[PDB]
């Protein structure tokens, strides 16, 4: 195979151009444009650089004696349309953008931002997600994700900016309504997970505090938000829940990413405690309980027909729901200037689970289809593999486990080639491409069979253990055999 | 939380020993390099031992060669810094830090996170 290595520089995030196939990683004081085969075609230096979180970009030493040498972990990395979005942890989290297949040509950098453009946190301790859309004329947007950074000199957590703005020095900039106004961002303290685009909505997985609830405890939910809403009048808030809570804590999730359909409907959620599970939220069910919390708080004053409290308003702001006509959300689906928001549901979205790993904390979610079989890939805090067949059976089977690096935590920026025939995969300091279907390893019917990968079958034609695919012929199958040799 | 802490500075004779240890919590430092600074009064922070995340390279500075010596604990989540001989011009505050960069090296220039600090000081 294939493996990428920085002398032990660790590798934060990963994206792949879908029309090139070139690989693009964010290391600490690196930038990496890597072939699909891992080879270096490009190196930028995030550099080690003079800051302090307590200084203003750009830095000038004599303004800034606290400054000592900082490292540069990549926060953000996105594929935009023309332009390699990129964020680093340093100078108050500013960005910039790059070409697509020569990383090294700078293409936009703000010479001058302020405090309006510190996009990324600041702490490399604390995660980014972000997401790239287009508006309604096609303007570039960037949703960004953002956790409480504390020493920071404070940024909303869900914010929508531009990317092609009118004036390029104002890029990565939100218009002052285009945010989530949260009051208390250190007591809510926002832990974000992924973020994806469904339709003409983008949603967030992130975790953060119920300060209304027993011991301010830390709850995991998803939020919505019109893509066109310039004001977030639109945004609701669910809180995700697997078997009540037993493990309770949304660690990563990804939806079914497969060459026939590249992004379904379900999304496959880890949660951790210890015990790890895998659950699953059909993506219409978080929109119908989105909508039922709408409906409720525009026009229920958040209660229900019974008059049990639903929907609420949302973060310390200082709204309330309402007696609404009963036509508002079908004729304001984004909001408007006076309709309830931000909006949240009392009411979670419970999941039970399909499989649960007792000795294993999860952190990386990837899942794709073979035939009508779906299958996951699971990364864990010890640097394993695991390998699940959940498919058209029922309850879970774990088939295979690897050991990518003993001890490291494998990230959950778990991509896949493009043909869907090989899965990127991150242990903090190692990148390796990994077959998904392993089949070549057995040569004989007996080898074949024993190691059981519903990708993998003894085709008699050829003398080969191979996919499907690879045979119209006699092909018999790994997992549920019917026959023997 | 992430943090580093650092502890068993405190006052000492001329020629005397002392263990400093630094402790992570909120993130295992296991495949990070570990580095000790030092800061004196009025001059700039200079770094003192440097171990990578196997602990098999280990660098110094030239102004303690053969009198500090440093040390890692994977499991424990702790480094310790063993000062020996020890000299006037050794009274600062020792600080300790954690970088991402090159972490199979032992080279330190830059840092991800810091500590507080403890400071030692030698009877003049
Ligand atoms: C939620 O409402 C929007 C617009 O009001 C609609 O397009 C969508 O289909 C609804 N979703 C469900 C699950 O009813
Ligand atoms: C009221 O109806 C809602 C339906 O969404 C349900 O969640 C709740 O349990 C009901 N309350 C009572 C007291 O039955
Ligand atoms: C940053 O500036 C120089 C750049 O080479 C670096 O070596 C030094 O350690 C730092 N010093 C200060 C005072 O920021």
Redesign the pocket.
Known sequence: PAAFTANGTHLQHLARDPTTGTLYVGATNFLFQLSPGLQLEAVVSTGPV?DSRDCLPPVI?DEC?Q???TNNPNQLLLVSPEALVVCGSVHQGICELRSLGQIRQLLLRPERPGDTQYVAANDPAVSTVGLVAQGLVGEPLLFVGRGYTSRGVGIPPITTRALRPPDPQAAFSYEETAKLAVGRLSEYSHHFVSAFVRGASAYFLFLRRDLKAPSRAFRAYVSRVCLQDQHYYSYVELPLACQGGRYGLIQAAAVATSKEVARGDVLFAAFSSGTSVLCAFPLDEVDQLANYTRDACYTREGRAENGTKVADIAYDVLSDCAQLPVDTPDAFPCGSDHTPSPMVSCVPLEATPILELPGVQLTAVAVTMEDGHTIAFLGDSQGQLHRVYLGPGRSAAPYSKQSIQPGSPVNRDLTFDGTFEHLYVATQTTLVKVPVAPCAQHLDCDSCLAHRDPYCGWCVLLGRCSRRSECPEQWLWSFQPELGC | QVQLQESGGGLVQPGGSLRLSCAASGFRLDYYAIGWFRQAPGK?REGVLCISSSGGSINYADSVKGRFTISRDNAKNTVYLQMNSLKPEDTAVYYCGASSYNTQRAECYGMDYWGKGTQVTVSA
């Open positions: 003079n030493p004696p400054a000592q040498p | 700039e």
